[PDB]
Symmetry: C3
Subunit: 183 residues, 3 copies
Amino acid sequence: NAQIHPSAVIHEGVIIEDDVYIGPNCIIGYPPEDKAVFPQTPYTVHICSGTKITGNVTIDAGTIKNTYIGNDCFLMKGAYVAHDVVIGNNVTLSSHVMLGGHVEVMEGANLGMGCIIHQRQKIWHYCMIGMGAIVTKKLVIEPFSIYVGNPAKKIGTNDKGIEKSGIDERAMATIQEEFNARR
Amino acid sequence: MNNNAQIHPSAVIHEGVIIEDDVYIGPNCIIGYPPEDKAVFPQTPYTVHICSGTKITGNVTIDAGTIKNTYIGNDCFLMKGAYVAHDVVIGNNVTLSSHVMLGGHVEVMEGANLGMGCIIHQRQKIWHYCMIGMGAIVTKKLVIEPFSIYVGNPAKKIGTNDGIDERAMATIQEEFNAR
Amino acid sequence: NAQIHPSAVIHEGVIIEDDVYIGPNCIIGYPPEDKAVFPQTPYTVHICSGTKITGNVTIDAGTIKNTYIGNDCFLMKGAYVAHDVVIGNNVTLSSHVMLGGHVEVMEGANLGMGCIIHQRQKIWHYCMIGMGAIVTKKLVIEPFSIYVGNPAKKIGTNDKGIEKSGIDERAMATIQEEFNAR
Ligand SMILES: CC(C)(COP(=O)(O)OP(=O)(O)OC[C@H]1O[C@@H](n2cnc3c(N)ncnc32)[C@H](O)[C@@H]1OP(=O)(O)O)[C@@H](O)C(=O)NCCC(=O)NCCS
Ligand SMILES: CC(C)(COP(=O)(O)OP(=O)(O)OC[C@H]1O[C@@H](n2cnc3c(N)ncnc32)[C@H](O)[C@@H]1OP(=O)(O)O)[C@@H](O)C(=O)NCCC(=O)NCCS
Ligand SMILES: CC(C)(COP(=O)(O)OP(=O)(O)OC[C@H]1O[C@@H](n2cnc3c(N)ncnc32)[C@H](O)[C@@H]1OP(=O)(O)O)[C@@H](O)C(=O)NCCC(=O)NCCS
Ligand SMILES: CC(=O)N[C@H]1[C@@H](OP(=O)(O)OP(=O)(O)OC[C@H]2O[C@@H](n3ccc(=O)[nH]c3=O)[C@H](O)[C@@H]2O)O[C@H](C(=O)O)[C@@H](O)[C@@H]1N
Ligand SMILES: CC(=O)N[C@H]1[C@@H](OP(=O)(O)OP(=O)(O)OC[C@H]2O[C@@H](n3ccc(=O)[nH]c3=O)[C@H](O)[C@@H]2O)O[C@H](C(=O)O)[C@@H](O)[C@@H]1N
Ligand code: NA
């Protein structure tokens, strides 16, 4: 049953599952920051069980679907989740991470402090986005990869992230198959 | 102040702030608290003035001035976590994306669009219909031109920005060539 | 005697000394953003006299020690101070400065808007970190130095900072020797 800090600001209609932590001063389900839609809330937010949202996190209502946070996610101070974002399971957003509209973040991705993701981007499984990395609209974000810089570029594979997941070269090759066949 | 402004009850608005009609102030905004200037803090000799039609969506901070009211123009849109320092002047129809940071005395002209997490050095001027890209760092020396796109750390011009007319553009260009 | 805005959210246990300003909507002493510890608070936060925290600043409780803010610091809107950070005296954090876990910031350092400091880094005396600078784990920060960019690189010596401080040549040699040993 959700532990919602009294100072958290939760819009009518937001779905918060059991075993969700919502910390002080979060703003959840307020209108999408889309000038065609604001201040209407056509959709809301859905936060799934085991997710911890520590404080001052903003997660906007969707325009075409519920903004979605998967199981066992960890969102740290001042993170910004725009309208229609879909976050998978076991995702970490560090402090002041910024996800633009319609961004998808896949299973186990780790987004470092103050990284910034262009609207409509896709961060694939077990990616590590470095502090302050700027993911521009056309960048191809490969699974299991580390991205750094302005603009963001691949510097290697996320070995650290792979180990912790405890996942085989089978379930990894499979994720590559999903990435490769995505178009 | 006797108008249809909608202010979320969690917004923290200093006494003396001027809020015009059709304004939206979202949750946990902090408006009109003392300028972050060690020579003045915690005094509030000036305040903040938000003009009609401006939407400030949540978690936005706009500090009171040191030498003038901090000033937000008509029909602006300020998104989550934006920071507006003392003595900033924003013109009409400006967009600040999430976590945009405007240093002290920054001026932002008509129609400027500032992308997520860009940072503008104190005393800079962002000219008419400029596009500042996400995460761009605008340093003190950069000479911003009207209608231009800036990206990067540090910020550099990369282009001109995509229904004003040639007579209106010439009048802007005129203001710029004299300053 | 600490002046604490009614909207500031202060965890049970937080130590706030006299002549401290805590502005609107600060979150101080909430659990460390460490998945091994959260939501436990094994330690807290200690803010020392003279410090001004202007608004919307987050300072998390420690995992291995009290998160510590020294005397006469100035922390501006939206600054993020992670678990186990130790900030010395007369430090300035501009708006949206991010200090990762266990970061140490020494005497008179000045961190510019939205700069980002990797966990376990050390920012030495009277350093200037420029707006948006990304301090990565391998950067050997040196006292009195100016760092800018993504990633951060040394660009010069913080003469403005040294001059303001009024620190003489004797004091600078002691800091320089403290660095040469550690
Ligand atoms: C991206 C990251 C994982 C890389 O760490 P690493 O693999 O140990 O990398 P290194 O520090 O050895 O640096 C490797 C190279 O990448 C660069 N680099 C590393 N992190 C960078 C970053 N965030 N931005 C830009 N460049 C970066 C280094 O400058 C170096 O460049 P070089 O090849 O010219 O020497 C790390 O720097 C990072 O950003 N982690 C996130 C920290 C964070 O968000 N902490 C919050 C915890 S809650
Ligand atoms: C600045 C911006 C408008 C440029 O758009 P664009 O011209 O379509 O840019 P593209 O991604 O097609 O590529 C332009 C070039 O500049 C680079 N670039 C674009 N935006 C950049 C940014 N923010 N930082 C760094 N480099 C950037 C690209 O890498 C590319 O470099 P290259 O051509 O040398 O390979 C856009 O990228 C941007 O930053 N928009 C902000 C997004 C935002 O804030 N959304 C929130 C909505 S509320
Ligand atoms: C870092 C800083 C102190 C350097 O200022 P400065 O010494 O006057 O430097 P200049 O503006 O003369 O620029 C020198 C070089 O550094 C670069 N530079 C300066 N600041 C930079 C920054 N923040 N990021 C990247 N590059 C930067 C310039 O591009 C220039 O490069 P070039 O030699 O290739 O042309 C300043 O730019 C800064 O970032 N200050 C922090 C601002 C702030 O947070 N204010 C809030 C007030 S509370
Ligand atoms: C906390 C506080 O008082 N802040 C105010 C104050 O900032 P400021 O201390 O940076 O002084 P400035 O004279 O602008 O610095 C000039 C240059 O030197 C750089 N600078 C500064 C300090 C330092 O130690 N090192 C350094 O390199 C600096 O980065 C810059 O590039 O003055 C700003 C201003 O009037 O525009 C206000 O917007 C601020 N609210
Ligand atoms: C969410 C959480 O628990 N956070 C805490 C935790 O961080 P952390 O999970 O990043 O582990 P670390 O041992 O610092 O990673 C080492 C390096 O690998 C990088 N790293 C990390 C994960 C990944 O998948 N890939 C990767 O490259 C990583 O970016 C870094 O460059 O531990 C930190 C700490 O002990 O000081 C705390 O400050 C944090 N608040
Ligand atoms: Na609040």
